[PDB]
Amino acid sequence: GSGYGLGLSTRTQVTGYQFLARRTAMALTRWRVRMEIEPGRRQTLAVVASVSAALVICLGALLWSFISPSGQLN
Amino acid sequence: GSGYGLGLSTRTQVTGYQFLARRTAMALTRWRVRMEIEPGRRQTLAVVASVSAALVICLGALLWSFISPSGQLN
Amino acid sequence: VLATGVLGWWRWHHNTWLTTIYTAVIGVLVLAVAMLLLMRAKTDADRRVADIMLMSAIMPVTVAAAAAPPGPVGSPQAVLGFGVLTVAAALALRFTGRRLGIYTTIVIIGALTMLAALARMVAATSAVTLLSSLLLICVVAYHAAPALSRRLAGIRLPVFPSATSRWVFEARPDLPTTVVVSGGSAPVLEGPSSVRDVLLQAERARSFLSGLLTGLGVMVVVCMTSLCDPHTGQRWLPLILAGFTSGFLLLRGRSYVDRWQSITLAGTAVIIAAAVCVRYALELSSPLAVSIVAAILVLLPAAGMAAAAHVPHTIYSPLFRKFVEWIEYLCLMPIFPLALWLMNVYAAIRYR
Amino acid sequence: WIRFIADTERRSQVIEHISTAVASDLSKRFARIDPIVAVQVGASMVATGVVLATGVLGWWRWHHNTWLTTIYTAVIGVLVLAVAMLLLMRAKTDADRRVAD
Amino acid sequence: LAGIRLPVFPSATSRWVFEARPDLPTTVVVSGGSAPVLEGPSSVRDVLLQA
Amino acid sequence: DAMRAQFMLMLDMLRETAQESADSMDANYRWFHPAPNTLAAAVGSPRMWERKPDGKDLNFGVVRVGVGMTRPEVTWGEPQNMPTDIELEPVTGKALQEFGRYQSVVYNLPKMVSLLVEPWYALVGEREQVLGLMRAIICQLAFSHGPDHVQMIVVSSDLDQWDWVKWLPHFGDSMVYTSVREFAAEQAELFAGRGSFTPRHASSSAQTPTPHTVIIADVDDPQWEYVISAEGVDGVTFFDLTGSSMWTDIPERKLQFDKTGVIEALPRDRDTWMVIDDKAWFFALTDQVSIAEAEEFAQKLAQWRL
């Protein structure tokens, strides 16, 4: 057949599928496909922003560690 | 429907409404709508400028307290 | 189930093999009856009967295994118990293909609990840390819920370059499938096999999602109400985290239009506040505390009823509708930065 | 009973694209949330809320003798009763009565 | 506070109908001059008191 | 993504337009050709003996045989400036292709056969399938057309199966035979007098004589060769219930029944009834009535006269 197996694929095919996943995902929760605005994108991006904020803060703490460590006694 | 409730809205709608508000606020104050110049915005930005200058001086003072700490009588 | 209860209470106070050994036969017996009922069952009423019995057999089987390890009850018993529970529920679901909801709920709490106890067993990690991590996994699971539910239901998305060929508009259409009924033996055809599955895949998809939301709901309330504590230092830190989490869930509901799906989200947000309020009154009991808790516990749901009655018949300008939307994103953003603070990770790194 | 039973024969309906097909079908076999149900939910939450408050207030009296428990509960009782009374006078339909009851 | 209502937006889900059936006019009365008179649509007459 | 989204949305509004036209056809075809079990109740209604032969009525001589696939009344215009095969975007490509495959046919519609198109119709399969469809065809003819327009004849040895025929008026005369030798003496003396078969159409219907003859063959007698080798006569139509080699030698007149009751035949045009392919393919799901059901229907019809 066609479409089965692990054949090659292209970058235009990768975005094409992600469009169908987002569109079908809202069809299960909102029962309409109009997609006037795309809230699924925003809600996911918000988590990515949150994680990034967590990563940024912990790197800052490591930078602090080299500027004034614990072993400087006496 | 007819617009009841908390449904989502787009950026084109947000400025669209805000423009209808400025034009009506002028009508109650000057009784004309020709609006060759729009003094309503101008008077508002001057306040925003005032708030911004005050906050910068607050941050400067807060930052100075960390650069060379001190204290006060109680 | 009541029998397994007293046997459990005994095992909770005595270190004898009685419960594991004596319960095993009890489970096997009910399971045997259930197997025959499933074979002999043909009508819908029988299936209801068969399902109830089968569901009852998993409980004794679960506690029996959990009670198998010797010595004081603890970390390893939990791993064994929730473990077989997870496999049993999943296994029952796969072959039964019925009661999708209730079985799915069991699978998730088991799986996450299995991963929780396993960590406590392999490493001396505190409950504080072990609970905060469960909170984060559940937060991201809500965003995954609509997608994860797509796979289990069997929806497939085709993408290929049109078979490396130009289109054929006059292609011979697919053959319609014929269907029959036991009494109404005269057959009738309804349509292409490819299209009928969608009408069935969709009904199945709705059930997996409803369960997945319920299972996650239980976990967030149990974890959150455990993190906040009235004696632990910096009392306000774990409490503020409970506030934003509640806000996020409460607003997220309006992405779901289904009746029971939406109420479970709203309900999940309200019950977390109520549950913390009770815990904060019993311990560290005092006149101000009980006076305060009693007020919050009655004003909060009251305002809710007020909002529910008036919002559907009033008009709001775009600048306000756009403002409530942004609260949701503002609520999600602080969860990760705070959870790590409560877990002392930043202090741990700053002092390496 | 002698009865007339109509013909059930009619055309079939097909939608090929998976997302549109899921949305169409899923909207005809289930019920969506509506304002009528929202109010009943609101009433149910307040009822559950007050029984929890009286519970904790009672738990204090079982260990303390002050008037606090009776004083605090009396005002809540009067307020809840006052609202219920006001609603019963305004109810027009059975839906409203379920809220009031 | 005076209740001035800015027009509600169509939310981008329907086309405009250029000429729907016109809105019904409203009647007014006076006791001494018992003969009633009519003057306009309800939506317009209110603004003159609203301002 | 915005362009893809808008393209999908525009495609669904066309779908609604197609579905609305589809509903009109369902209502229209059923209104002229109901299912056999419902005709009994309609006997008193004015819909009985309604059909006319006078050229404008295109449904004259048409009989419902079952349910199956049909081509809708829509006419699709091909897309302008079609991009070359290597230039097509993947998402919209399959969409326009599958749209074209499914929306080009509508499922579960009533299929029909016209007596004005063939000298005979060979029924091949098990006895129950063959007799069931014949009983259905007979009652459909009997409800829509009056005795001043249709007359029927049966030649069979298994008279216990054709007993119910007694009540219908269309089997009267100014009538069941045991063998061709018997049929040849009484009936063939009248019919052999003139003509040979000639396929007709609606406009031509105004010229053919009013009484059309339907003949049922259930004896397998080799003596039938005389009229069959002469390619019949106009105003007659034969149904072979036996499947004899002399009738079964033309695929264009052979209807094959599967184990599931599905009929296969060569495809024919909805507007011209002309054969469009030389390979047999799915045609319709068989509709059938029992002997008791047929006699019940005949008794209700037997109560009325001009």
Numbering used by the authors:
A (entry chain B6), B (entry chain B3): 10 to 83
C (entry chain D1): 152 to 503
D (entry chain D2): 102 to 202
E (entry chain D3): 303 to 353
F (entry chain C6): 101 to 274, 285 to 416
How did the manuscript describe this experimental structure?
Specialized protein transport systems—known as type VII secretion systems (T7SSs)—are central to the virulence of this pathogen, and are also crucial for nutrient and metabolite transport across the mycobacterial cell envelope. Mycobacterium tuberculosis encodes five homologous, but functionally distinct, T7SSs that are designated ESX-1 to ESX-5. These systems translocate a number of effector proteins across the unique and impermeable diderm cell envelope. Here we reconstituted the ESX-5 T7SS of M. tuberculosis H37Rv in M. smegmatis to obtain a structural view of the entire T7SS membrane complex from this human pathogen.
To further investigate the effect of MycP5 on the entire structure, we analysed MycP5-free M. tuberculosis ESX-5 complexes from the same preparation. These assemblies contained the same EccB5:EccC5:EccD5:EccE5 stoichiometry as the fully assembled complexes. Following 3D reconstruction, we obtained two MycP5-free M. tuberculosis ESX-5 maps that displayed resolution estimates of about 4.5 and about 6.7 Å. The differences were most notable on the periplasmic side, on which the six EccB5 copies showed high flexibility and did not form a stable triangular scaffold in the absence of MycP5. This shows that MycP5 enables the trimerization of the EccB5 dimers in the periplasm. However, the MycP5-free particles displayed an increased heterogeneity that affected the entire complex, which resulted in a slight waving of the membrane region and an increased angle variation between individual protomers. Complexes without MycP5 show disruption of the EccB5 periplasmic assembly and increased flexibility, which highlights the importance of MycP5 for complex integrity. Our MycP5-free M. tuberculosis ESX-5 maps are reminiscent of the hexameric, low-resolution negative-stain structure of ESX-5 from Mycobacterium xenopi, in which the periplasm was similarly disorganized in the absence of MycP55.
